[PDB]
Design a protein around this motif. Structure first.
Motif, PDB file in Angstrom:
ATOM      1  N   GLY A   5      87.606  -0.428  58.678  1.00  0.00           N
ATOM      2  CA  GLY A   5      88.706  -1.074  59.308  1.00  0.00           C
ATOM      3  C   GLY A   5      90.000  -0.759  58.604  1.00  0.00           C
ATOM      4  O   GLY A   5      91.046  -0.924  59.205  1.00  0.00           O
ATOM      5  N   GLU A   6      89.956  -0.382  57.320  1.00  0.00           N
ATOM      6  CA  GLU A   6      91.212  -0.072  56.626  1.00  0.00           C
ATOM      7  C   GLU A   6      91.731   1.271  57.093  1.00  0.00           C
ATOM      8  O   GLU A   6      92.916   1.544  57.276  1.00  0.00           O
ATOM      9  CB  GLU A   6      91.006  -0.015  55.112  1.00  0.00           C
ATOM     10  CG  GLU A   6      90.435  -1.338  54.647  1.00  0.00           C
ATOM     11  CD  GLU A   6      90.307  -1.520  53.161  1.00  0.00           C
ATOM     12  OE1 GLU A   6      90.918  -2.410  52.562  1.00  0.00           O
ATOM     13  OE2 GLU A   6      89.476  -0.652  52.610  1.00  0.00           O
ATOM     14  N   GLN A   8      91.089   2.270  59.938  1.00  0.00           N
ATOM     15  CA  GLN A   8      91.595   2.194  61.287  1.00  0.00           C
ATOM     16  C   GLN A   8      93.019   1.774  61.332  1.00  0.00           C
ATOM     17  O   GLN A   8      93.748   2.264  62.154  1.00  0.00           O
ATOM     18  CB  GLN A   8      90.755   1.380  62.225  1.00  0.00           C
ATOM     19  CG  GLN A   8      89.421   2.082  62.561  1.00  0.00           C
ATOM     20  CD  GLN A   8      88.520   1.212  63.490  1.00  0.00           C
ATOM     21  OE1 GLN A   8      89.011   0.294  64.165  1.00  0.00           O
ATOM     22  NE2 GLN A   8      87.238   1.604  63.664  1.00  0.00           N
ATOM     23  N   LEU A   9      93.382   0.895  60.417  1.00  0.00           N
ATOM     24  CA  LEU A   9      94.750   0.472  60.352  1.00  0.00           C
ATOM     25  C   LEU A   9      95.626   1.606  59.866  1.00  0.00           C
ATOM     26  O   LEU A   9      96.799   1.627  60.147  1.00  0.00           O
ATOM     27  CB  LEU A   9      94.930  -0.725  59.406  1.00  0.00           C
ATOM     28  CG  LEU A   9      94.072  -1.938  59.761  1.00  0.00           C
ATOM     29  CD1 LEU A   9      93.986  -2.859  58.551  1.00  0.00           C
ATOM     30  CD2 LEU A   9      94.716  -2.726  60.861  1.00  0.00           C
ATOM     31  N   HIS A  12      96.019   3.711  62.790  1.00  0.00           N
ATOM     32  CA  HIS A  12      96.693   3.025  63.872  1.00  0.00           C
ATOM     33  C   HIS A  12      98.192   3.145  63.591  1.00  0.00           C
ATOM     34  O   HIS A  12      99.046   3.494  64.409  1.00  0.00           O
ATOM     35  CB  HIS A  12      96.178   1.586  63.882  1.00  0.00           C
ATOM     36  CG  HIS A  12      97.032   0.793  64.767  1.00  0.00           C
ATOM     37  ND1 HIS A  12      96.804   0.761  66.133  1.00  0.00           N
ATOM     38  CD2 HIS A  12      98.173   0.084  64.501  1.00  0.00           C
ATOM     39  CE1 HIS A  12      97.813   0.057  66.653  1.00  0.00           C
ATOM     40  NE2 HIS A  12      98.641  -0.383  65.705  1.00  0.00           N
ATOM     41  N   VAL A  13      98.609   2.912  62.376  1.00  0.00           N
ATOM     42  CA  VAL A  13     100.049   3.129  62.147  1.00  0.00           C
ATOM     43  C   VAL A  13     100.455   4.640  62.140  1.00  0.00           C
ATOM     44  O   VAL A  13     101.586   5.058  62.441  1.00  0.00           O
ATOM     45  CB  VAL A  13     100.612   2.256  60.982  1.00  0.00           C
ATOM     46  CG1 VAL A  13     100.091   2.824  59.716  1.00  0.00           C
ATOM     47  CG2 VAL A  13     102.129   2.417  60.903  1.00  0.00           C
ATOM     48  N   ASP A 122     103.635  -3.390  63.326  1.00  0.00           N
ATOM     49  CA  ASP A 122     102.336  -2.768  63.253  1.00  0.00           C
ATOM     50  C   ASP A 122     102.059  -2.510  61.808  1.00  0.00           C
ATOM     51  O   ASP A 122     101.187  -1.728  61.508  1.00  0.00           O
ATOM     52  CB  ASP A 122     102.369  -1.392  63.875  1.00  0.00           C
ATOM     53  CG  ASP A 122     102.536  -1.500  65.347  1.00  0.00           C
ATOM     54  OD1 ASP A 122     103.623  -1.357  65.878  1.00  0.00           O
ATOM     55  OD2 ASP A 122     101.406  -1.811  65.945  1.00  0.00           O
ATOM     56  N   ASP A 126      98.111  -6.692  55.921  1.00  0.00           N
ATOM     57  CA  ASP A 126      96.849  -5.936  56.005  1.00  0.00           C
ATOM     58  C   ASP A 126      97.076  -4.406  56.162  1.00  0.00           C
ATOM     59  O   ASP A 126      96.437  -3.616  55.532  1.00  0.00           O
ATOM     60  CB  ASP A 126      96.030  -6.440  57.191  1.00  0.00           C
ATOM     61  CG  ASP A 126      96.860  -6.440  58.498  1.00  0.00           C
ATOM     62  OD1 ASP A 126      96.345  -6.799  59.551  1.00  0.00           O
ATOM     63  OD2 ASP A 126      98.173  -6.084  58.436  1.00  0.00           O
ATOM     64  N   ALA A 127      97.944  -3.942  57.044  1.00  0.00           N
ATOM     65  CA  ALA A 127      98.099  -2.521  57.155  1.00  0.00           C
ATOM     66  C   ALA A 127      98.761  -1.928  55.933  1.00  0.00           C
ATOM     67  O   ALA A 127      98.518  -0.821  55.509  1.00  0.00           O
ATOM     68  CB  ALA A 127      99.021  -2.228  58.333  1.00  0.00           C
ATOM     69  N   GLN A 128      99.729  -2.610  55.426  1.00  0.00           N
ATOM     70  CA  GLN A 128     100.474  -2.122  54.343  1.00  0.00           C
ATOM     71  C   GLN A 128      99.506  -1.898  53.157  1.00  0.00           C
ATOM     72  O   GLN A 128      99.483  -0.883  52.433  1.00  0.00           O
ATOM     73  CB  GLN A 128     101.498  -3.240  54.113  1.00  0.00           C
ATOM     74  CG  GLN A 128     102.619  -2.981  53.137  1.00  0.00           C
ATOM     75  CD  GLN A 128     103.749  -4.013  53.380  1.00  0.00           C
ATOM     76  OE1 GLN A 128     103.798  -4.823  54.358  1.00  0.00           O
ATOM     77  NE2 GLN A 128     104.704  -3.998  52.462  1.00  0.00           N
ATOM     78  N   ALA A 130      96.185  -1.426  53.355  1.00  0.00           N
ATOM     79  CA  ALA A 130      95.428  -0.296  53.689  1.00  0.00           C
ATOM     80  C   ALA A 130      96.228   0.966  53.425  1.00  0.00           C
ATOM     81  O   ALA A 130      95.704   1.864  52.830  1.00  0.00           O
ATOM     82  CB  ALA A 130      95.017  -0.267  55.132  1.00  0.00           C
TER      83      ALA A 130
END
Ligand code: HEM
Length: 152
Positions: A5-6, A8-9, A12-13, A122, A126-128, A130
């Motif tokens: 999932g990391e 994926q983020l 995703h970005v 986005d 969490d994304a940051q 990752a």
């Protein structure tokens, strides 16, 4: 390592960056030179760029940006499996350009900063998070390869 999932983020970005590599590359580089001007000296090509405006107007700089982002993106898409991709870069930074890991840390900072300036929605905690890991994983891989070649 990163979880699925990391990645994926990260990915995703990355897709957002992909809609404007040229635009993202230039911000990134400008930011880097601006925050850490000493990195600017590695580029004899860019050294004479006096202001931002002029950095912005430079075709050369913008073409360089796409190159940098393109290679990076190819690496990230490998989710960890990027030795083939990564090797040429370690080889050249150890042997030709001599870019210190520290410099790679400043550029990662600039990346983070840009992504966050452009895609706050986005680009949460969490994304940051990752992304940071993903960039740290690259830097660590590079560091090791550099040593294998005789370069700090
Ligand atoms: C995400 C990090 C980076 C990536 C993926 C990256 C990628 C590249 C690529 C693909 C090239 C072209 C081929 C080569 O010369 O190996 C390059 C060239 C170069 N890179 Fe980087 N780079 C990164 C960060 C840096 C940093 C932080 C510096 C240090 C200030 C640096 C300095 C240079 C220089 C001086 C060249 C020569 C380019 C030219 O003169 O045409 N790079 N980089």
């Amino acid at each position: 390592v990163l979880s699925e999932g990391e990645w994926q983020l990260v990915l995703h970005v990355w897709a957002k960056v992909e809609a404007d590599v040229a635009g993202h590359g230039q911000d990134i580089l400008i930011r880097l030179f601006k925050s850490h001007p000493e990195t600017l000296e590695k580029f004899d090509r860019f050294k004479h760029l006096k202001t931002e405006a002029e950095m912005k107007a430079s075709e050369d700089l913008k073409k360089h940006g796409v190159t940098v982002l393109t290679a990076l993106g190819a690496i990230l898409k490998k989710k960890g499996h990027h030795e083939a991709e990564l090797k040429p870069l370690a080889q050249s930074g150890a042997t030709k350009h001599k870019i210190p890991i520290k410099y790679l840390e400043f550029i990662s900072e600039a990346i983070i900063h840009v992504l966050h300036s452009r895609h706050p929605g986005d680009f949460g905690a969490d994304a940051q998070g990752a992304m940071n890991k993903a960039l740290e994983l690259f830097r660590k891989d590079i560091a090791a390869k550099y040593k294998e070649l005789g370069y700090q």
